[PDB]
Amino acid sequence: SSRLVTETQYGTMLMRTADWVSTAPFDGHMSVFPVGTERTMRGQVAEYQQAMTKWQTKYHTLSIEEHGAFGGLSGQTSNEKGLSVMALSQHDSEPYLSQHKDNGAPAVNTADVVSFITERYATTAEVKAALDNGEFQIAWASAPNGMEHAAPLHYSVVDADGNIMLIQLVKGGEQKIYLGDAESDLRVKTNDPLQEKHREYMQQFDLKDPSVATKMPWSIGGLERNSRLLAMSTHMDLEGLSYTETVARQKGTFDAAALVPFGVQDPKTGEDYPSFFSMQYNLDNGDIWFRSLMSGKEIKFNLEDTKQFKTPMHADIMAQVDKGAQTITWSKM
Amino acid sequence: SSRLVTETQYGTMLMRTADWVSTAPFDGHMSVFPVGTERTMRGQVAEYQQAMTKWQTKYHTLSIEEHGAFGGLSGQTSNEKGLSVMALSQHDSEPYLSQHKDNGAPAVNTADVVSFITERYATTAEVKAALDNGEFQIAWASAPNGMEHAAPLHYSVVDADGNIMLIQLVKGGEQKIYLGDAESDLRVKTNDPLQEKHREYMQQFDLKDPSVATKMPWSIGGLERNSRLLAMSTHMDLEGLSYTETVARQKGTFDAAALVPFGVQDPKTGEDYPSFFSMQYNLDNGDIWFRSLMSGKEIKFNLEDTKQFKTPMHADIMAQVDKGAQTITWSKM
Numbered sequence: 221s222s223r224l225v226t227e228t229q230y231g232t233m234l235m236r237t238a239d240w241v242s243t244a245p246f247d248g249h250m251s252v253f254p255v256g257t258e259r260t261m262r263g264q265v266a267e268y269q270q271a272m273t274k275w276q277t278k279y280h281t282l283s284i285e286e287h288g289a290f291g292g293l294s295g296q297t298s299n300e301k302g303l304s305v306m307a308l309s310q311h312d313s314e315p316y317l318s319q320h321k322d323n324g325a326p327a328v329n330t331a332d333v334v335s336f337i338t339e340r341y342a343t344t345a346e347v348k349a350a351l352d353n354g355e356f357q358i359a360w361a362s363a364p365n366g367m368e369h370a371a372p373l374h375y376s377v378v379d380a381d382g383n384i385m386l387i388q389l390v391k392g393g394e395q396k397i398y399l400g401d402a403e404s405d406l407r408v409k410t411n412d413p414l415q416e417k418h419r420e421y422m423q424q425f426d427l428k429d430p431s432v433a434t435k436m437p438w439s440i441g442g443l444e445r446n447s448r449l450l451a452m453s454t455h456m457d458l459e460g461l462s463y464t465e466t467v468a469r470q471k472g473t474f475d476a477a478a479l480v481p482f483g484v485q486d487p488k489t490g491e492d493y494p495s496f497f498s499m500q501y502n503l504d505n506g507d508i509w510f511r512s513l514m515s516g517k518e519i520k521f522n523l524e525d526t527k528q529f530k531t532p533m534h535a536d537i538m539a540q541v542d543k544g545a546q547t548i549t550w551s552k553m
Numbered sequence: 554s555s556r557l558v559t560e561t562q563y564g565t566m567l568m569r570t571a572d573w574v575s576t577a578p579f580d581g582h583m584s585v586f587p588v589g590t591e592r593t594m595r596g597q598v599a600e601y602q603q604a605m606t607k608w609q610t611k612y613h614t615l616s617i618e619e620h621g622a623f624g625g626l627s628g629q630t631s632n633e634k635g636l637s638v639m640a641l642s643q644h645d646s647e648p649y650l651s652q653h654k655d656n657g658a659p660a661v662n663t664a665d666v667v668s669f670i671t672e673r674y675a676t677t678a679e680v681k682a683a684l685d686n687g688e689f690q691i692a693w694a695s696a697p698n699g700m701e702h703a704a705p706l707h708y709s710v711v712d713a714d715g716n717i718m719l720i721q722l723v724k725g726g727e728q729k730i731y732l733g734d735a736e737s738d739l740r741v742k743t744n745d746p747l748q749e750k751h752r753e754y755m756q757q758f759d760l761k762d763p764s765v766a767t768k769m770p771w772s773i774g775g776l777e778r779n780s781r782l783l784a785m786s787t788h789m790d791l792e793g794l795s796y797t798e799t800v801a802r803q804k805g806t807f808d809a810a811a812l813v814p815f816g817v818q819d820p821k822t823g824e825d826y827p828s829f830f831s832m833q834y835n836l837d838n839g840d841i842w843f844r845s846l847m848s849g850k851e852i853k854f855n856l857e858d859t860k861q862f863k864t865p866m867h868a869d870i871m872a873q874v875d876k877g878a879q880t881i882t883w884s885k886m
C-alpha cells in the first residue's frame with residue numbers, strides 16, 4: 221500500500237492504494253457512520269486494562285473496510301471536517317507489537333481505531349492531543365477483530381490543512397509519532413521498512429534533479445515505492461491545470477510511482493504484492509474516487525451525498541464497482 | 554510510445570500509448586474510412602518515382618491521427634478484419650531515412666501509410682506479401698504531409714490471430730522485417746534503440762524469473778520500457794478472469810511497465826516524454842478504449858458503431874473525452 225498527499229490549489233488531495241498478496245485478494249467495502257451513532261467496538265483488547273467498548277459518533281464518517289483478508293478492518297477513513305485516517309501494513313513492526321506497553325488509556329481494537337479517530341476528532345492536532353492526554357490508545361498488541369494475531373500496521377492522520385501525523389511502533393515496542401506538513405517527506409507513506417530507514421535510504425538521492433527517478437532502483441517493495449513517490453511528486457507541476465486535470469495528474473503520477481502490478485515477485489519476500497483498489501480524496505471538498513484495479517473501473521462521489529442517512533449504512537463498494545455500478549447502492553448496516 | 558499484444562481467451566488484446574515531449578503536447582483525433590471510399594493520399598512523395606496517389610478502401614477502417622505535433626499523421630489503425638497497424642517513434646532510424654531505396658512500387662506518404670495498410674489488407678501475411686510483391690512501399694525518405702523532414706518512425710502490423718510484423722529502417726537504409734507472434738518478444742514494441750539492440754540488452758535478463766522486473770533498471774526511455782513490458786507480460790496470468798478483468802489486467806500491467814508520468818526527465822535526452830493518450834483494442838470483437846491521460850477519462854466503443862457511416866467521418870476524440878463526453882460526436886470530413 222502507498223499513500224500520497226499533494227497540496228493543490230483546489231484542495232488537499234490524498235491518494236492511497238490497498239496492496240496485498242494475490243493469494244488472499246482484497247475486497248473493499250464502505251460503511252457510513254452518521255452523527256449520534258451509538259457505536260460498539262469490534263473485537264477484544266484483552267491485553268489492555270481498559271477497552272474503548274462504546275462511543276458516540278461526533279463527526280459523520282465514511283470508513284473503507286478490507287474484507288478479503290483483514291476481516292473487515294477499517295483501513296481508510298474520512299469525515300465531514302476533512303480529516304483522513306489510514307492504516308497501512310508495516311511488517312517491520314511485527315516483532316515489536318507484543319512489546320507495546322499499555323498506558324492505561326481505553327484501547328481501541330485495530331479493526332476500528334482508524335474509524336474511531338475520524339468519528340471523534342477534526343484535526344491532526346486534536347488527534348495528537350487526544351493521544352497525549354490518554355483519551356485513547358491503539359491496541360497494538362491485540363489481534364484485530366476476528367483474526368488470530370496482532371497485525372503489523374502503521375497509522376497516519378492527514379487533515380484538511382495538510383497537517384500530517386505518522387504513528388509507528390518501533391524497536392522495543394515504543395510508539396514514535398512524526399509530525400509534518402504536506403510538503404514534508406511525510407506526504408509519502410508506504411510499508412516496511414520503518415521511517416528512519418526510509419530517511420536513511422533517501423539521503424543518497426538528490427530530489428531536486430528532475431531525472432532522479434531514473435537513478436532509483438525499482439521494485440514492488442515499500443522502500444522503492446517511497447523513494448519513487450517522493451521523486452515523482454517533487455517534479456509534479458500543477459500550474460495552469462483545471463481541477464479534473466489536477467486530479468488526473470496526481471493519479472497518473474502516483475500510479476507510475478506506486479501501482480503494483482500482478483505477477484511480479486519481490487525477492488525479499490518470495491511473494492507478489494499487487495494493488496487491488498485505490499482511493500483519491502479532496503479533503504477540502506468531500507470528493508472521493510474509488511477505483512478497483514481488478515476491473516479497472518472507478519466511481520466518483522462525495523461525502524456530503526451520505527449525510528442524508530440517519531443510521532449506519534454499508535456497501536460492498538468494490539464488488540459494485542467491479543459489476544460496473546456508477547452509483548453506490550447502500551444497505552442498512 | 555509503447556505497444557503490447559496479449560493473447561487471451563476473449564481475443565487478441567492490444568494496448569498502445571502515445572508519448573511525446575511536454576513542449577509539444579499530443580492531440581489525438583480519429584477518422585473513419587468506409588468500404589468503397591475513393592481515397593486521395595495526403596502529402597507528396599517526390600523522392601519516389603511512383604506515388605500511391607489514389608486507392609479504394611477495401612476494409613472499414615478507423616484511424617487515430619496525431620494533430621498536436623505530427624500534422625495529422627495516422628499512427629494507429631484498425632479494420633473490420635481485426636488487423637491493427639501502428640507507427641511509433643524510432644529516433645535511431647533517423648540517420649538512414651534518406652537512404653531507403655525506391656523499389657519502384659507506388660509509395661505511400663507516411664501520414665497515411667498506416668491507414669492505407671488497414672484499408673487494403675486483412676492479415677499480417679497479406680501485408681508482407683504485398684510488400685514482397687511491390688504493391689506499395691512506405692515513403693521513408695519523404696516528409697509526412699505538412700511537415701519539413703522525413704520522420705523517424707517504425708511500423709508494425711498485428712492481426713486478429715496474433716501474427717506480428719515489425720518494419721524497421723536500419724543501417725544503410727535497409728528495410729528490416731521481423732516476424733513473430735504475440736508470444737514472441739515482438740509482442741512488445743517501444744522506441745529507440747533499434748530491435749537488435751533491445752534484443753542484445755534483453756540477453757542479460759532471465760524472463761522466467763518472476764522477480765526479474767525488480768532486477769531491471771527503470772527509466773522513461775524505450776529501452777527500459779521494452780524490458781519492463783516483456784518482464785511484466787511474461788508473468789501476467791489471465792486464468793479464471795472474466796473479460797472485464799482480463800482487459801483491466803492487461804491495462805494495469807501495461808501501465809505499470811510503460812505509462813510515462815509528467816515531470817520525469819530522461820538524462821539521455823534532457824527532455825521529458827509523458828504519455829498523453831492510450832488505446833486498447835480487442836482485435837477479435839472490435840472493442841476499443843480511448844483514454845486521455847490529461848483528464849484521466851476514457852470512453853469505450855466498438856468499431857461496429859461506425860459501420861453505418863457511408864462517407865468518411867472525423868472526431869476530435871481526445872478533446873471530447875477531456876471534456877467529459879460519454880459518446881463520440883462525429884463530423885463529415
Ligand SMILES: CCCCCC(=O)CC(=O)O
Pocket residue numbers: 221237238239248284285286290293294295296307308309373
Ligand atoms: C482499506 C485498506 C486496507 C486495510 C488493510 C491494510 O492495512 C493493508 C494495506 O493496504 O496495507
Ligand SMILES: CCCCCC(=O)CC(=O)O
Pocket residue numbers: 554570571572581617618619623626627628629640641642706
Ligand atoms: C496515434 C499515435 C501517434 C502517432 C504519432 C507517433 O507515431 C508518435 C509516437 O507515439 O511515438
